[PDB]
Amino acid sequence: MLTIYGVYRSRASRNYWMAGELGLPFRSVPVVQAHRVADPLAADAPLNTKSPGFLAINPMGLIPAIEDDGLVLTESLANNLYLARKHGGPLAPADIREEGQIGNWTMWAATEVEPHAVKIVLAHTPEGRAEIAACARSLEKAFAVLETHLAERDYVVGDRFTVADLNLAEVFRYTMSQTDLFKRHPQVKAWLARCQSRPAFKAMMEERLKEPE
Amino acid sequence: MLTIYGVYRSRASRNYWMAGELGLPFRSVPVVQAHRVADPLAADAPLNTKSPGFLAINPMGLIPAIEDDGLVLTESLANNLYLARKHGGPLAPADIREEGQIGNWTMWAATEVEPHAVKIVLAHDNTPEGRAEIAACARSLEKAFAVLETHLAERDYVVGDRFTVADLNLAEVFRYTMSQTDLFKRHPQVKAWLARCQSRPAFKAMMEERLKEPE
Numbered sequence: 001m002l003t004i005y006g007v008y009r010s011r012a013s014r015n016y017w018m019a020g021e022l023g024l025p026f027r028s029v030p031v032v033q034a035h036r037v038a039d040p041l042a043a044d045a046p047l048n049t050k051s052p053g054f055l056a057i058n059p060m061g062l063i064p065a066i067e068d069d070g071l072v073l074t075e076s077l078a079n080n081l082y083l084a085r086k087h088g089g090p091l092a093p094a095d096i097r098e099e100g101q102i103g104n105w106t107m108w109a110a111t112e113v114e115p116h117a118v119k120i121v122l123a124h125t126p127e128g129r130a131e132i133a134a135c136a137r138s139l140e141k142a143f144a145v146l147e148t149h150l151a152e153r154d155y156v157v158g159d160r161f162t163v164a165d166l167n168l169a170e171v172f173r174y175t176m177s178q179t180d181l182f183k184r185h186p187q188v189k190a191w192l193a194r195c196q197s198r199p200a201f202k203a204m205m206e207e208r209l210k211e212p213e
Numbered sequence: 214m215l216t217i218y219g220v221y222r223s224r225a226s227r228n229y230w231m232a233g234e235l236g237l238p239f240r241s242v243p244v245v246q247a248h249r250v251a252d253p254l255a256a257d258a259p260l261n262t263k264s265p266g267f268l269a270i271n272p273m274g275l276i277p278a279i280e281d282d283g284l285v286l287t288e289s290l291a292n293n294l295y296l297a298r299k300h301g302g303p304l305a306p307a308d309i310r311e312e313g314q315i316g317n318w319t320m321w322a323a324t325e326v327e328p329h330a331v332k333i334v335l336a337h338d339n340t341p342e343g344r345a346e347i348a349a350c351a352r353s354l355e356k357a358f359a360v361l362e363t364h365l366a367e368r369d370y371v372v373g374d375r376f377t378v379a380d381l382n383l384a385e386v387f388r389y390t391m392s393q394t395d396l397f398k399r400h401p402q403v404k405a406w407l408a409r410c411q412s413r414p415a416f417k418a419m420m421e422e423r424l425k426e427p428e
């Protein structure tokens with residue numbers, strides 16, 4: 001069985017959604033970020049990223065981690081590529097060419113988009129604008145590239161929803177506060193709505209909503 | 214024949230090394246960073262990341278890009294995973310579990326090591342307060358070094374007790390940190406692992422070509 005370590009209000013959401021798309025039963029262990037807990041090492045602290053039990057399985061001290069048949073993996077987007085390769089189905093690459101493409105879009109998201117995106121979710125006056133207008137403009141390159149790629153496509157790879165769309169959608173979810181950025185990239189706007197209208201996404205976010213902020 | 218776009222004095226070194234490890238024939242197309250070039254769009258300009266001809270290959274305008282039978286891939290570390298998977302041999306994952314592990318280490322390097330590593334090399338290539346800004350980045354890397362150090366206590370390589378694409382990927386990210394001698398001093402197993410990776414003939418041959426390019 002699959003075990004997923006991490007609260008839904010974290011990058012673990014990427015793995016909960018993927019598991020849902022694949023139809024996998026899983027066990028959720030709601031490990032909390034150590035900064036959202038007042039004194040992480042107290043006996044009555046919630047299970048968190050600085051707990052020795054958790055550090056024994058992910059020495060990096062970050063969520064998510066998943067454990068599948070003894071194998072522990074600790075990188076959210078890569079976790080998803082592994083689940084797709086393992087379990088197959090339409091979300092998985094169908095040939096070596098798609099594997100390259102899916103891998104390429106996933107790493108592009110991780111290195112060129114996520115770092116700026118996540119700062120916006122941290123940010124979320126003239127001072128609040130400048131810090132956001134900086135991270136917003138950074139993303140113009142990324143948005144433009146995806147926008148052009150989606151001119152004649154509904155999905156990034158193989159004319160169907162894949163793990164590449166799922167990985168990307170979750171990174172781009174961090175940017176949704178930037179209304180203006182989406183308005184000038186309508187193909188990305190349409191694509192992200194298309195990804196988020198899926199039942200397994202809805203059902204992930206409903207579980208997520210049950211955790212206090 | 215594989216085409217690799219990018220000068221060796223770039224992240225394309227990662228793909229040149231990998232191709233060499235795999236014994237793949239490739240065509241090297243030098244593409245420089247547009248900021249190193251006086252007039253990137255002028256007709257006499259060397260091919261660069263802002264050249265329309267190149268932008269038609271990789272719309273992101275970054276190097277490396279590899280082209281394999283029409284398929285264009287544009288993320289150095291992931292390019293190597295693709296090459297390993299396609300061509301096989303001992304650098305490639307032998308099964309789904311190793312694929313998981315090799316993928317995890319690669320994404321860890323990309324998201325958790327490289328950003329700080331890059332800022333070392335960018336400041337170090339290009340002051341009393343300057344030595345303090347670097348120490349901030351150096352401290353952010355302690356975590357990552359410690360984790361790899363622990364993992365290497367009783368391993369010579371990160372996965373499957375042999376040199377794989379995960380080692381090659383990590384080695385190239387960690388090369389960016391080599392100026393930070395105190396960090397390596399305090400993590401002798403990482404230092405020994407890096408030297409072991411760099412002792413390999415394909416790495417030496419990649420660095421020999423690299424050294425021909427001006428700077």
Ligand SMILES: N[C@@H](CCC(=O)N[C@@H](CS)C(=O)NCC(=O)O)C(=O)O
Nearest residue numbers: 010011033034035062063075076324
């Ligand atoms: N690259 C990792 C990043 C993991 C990560 O940064 N996780 C955060 C939560 S979203 C965390 O656990 N932070 C620990 C803390 O700040 O206390 C991944 O994508 O899984």
Ligand SMILES: N[C@@H](CCC(=O)N[C@@H](CS)C(=O)NCC(=O)O)C(=O)O
Nearest residue numbers: 223224246247248275276277288289
């Ligand atoms: N994340 C990509 C992109 C790497 C990247 O940004 N490369 C640099 C040179 S190593 C570049 O293209 N610079 C061109 C410029 O922006 O001037 C990868 O790892 O392949």
